[PDB]
Amino acid sequence: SMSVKKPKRDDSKDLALCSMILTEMETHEDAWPFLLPVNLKLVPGYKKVIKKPMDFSTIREKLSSGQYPNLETFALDVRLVFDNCETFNEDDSDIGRAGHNMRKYFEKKWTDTFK
Incomplete structure (x- = not known):
């Protein structure tokens, strides 16, 4: 509350550390469905859903x-x-499985870097 603060967690490296995590996600072999925006002109249903x-x-x-x-x-x-x-x-699709793998990969890096 006013003039009452928890001790200051050092956040000065967060930018660099999120950049490193993102690099590791970018270079994972299952990243390919996620590297670029879904093409909303060429993928029926995506835009609306x-x-x-x-x-x-x-x-x-x-x-x-x-x-x-x-x-x-x-x-x-x-x-x-x-x-x-x-x-x-x-x-049960290559992309579906990619997504589950990547989320697992991310969540571990997140916990290990920050928790």
Whole structure:
């Protein structure tokens, strides 16, 4: 509350550490469905169904340009990429499986870097 603060968690490396995590996601062999925005002209149903499209290149641009106020807003966009994928793709598809693998990969890196 006013003039009453919890001890200051050092957040000065968060930008660099989120960039490293994102690099590792970008270079994973199962990243290919997620590297670029889904082409809304060429993928029927996507535009209407997925209210907030997100992809790694869009996260990378947002990161590079100071559009994440904090590390939680960054994790929300990464998770959004996987939640979108689950909304649109059957679990038993190459893309569906890619999404589950990537989310697992991300969540471990997140816990190990920050928790």
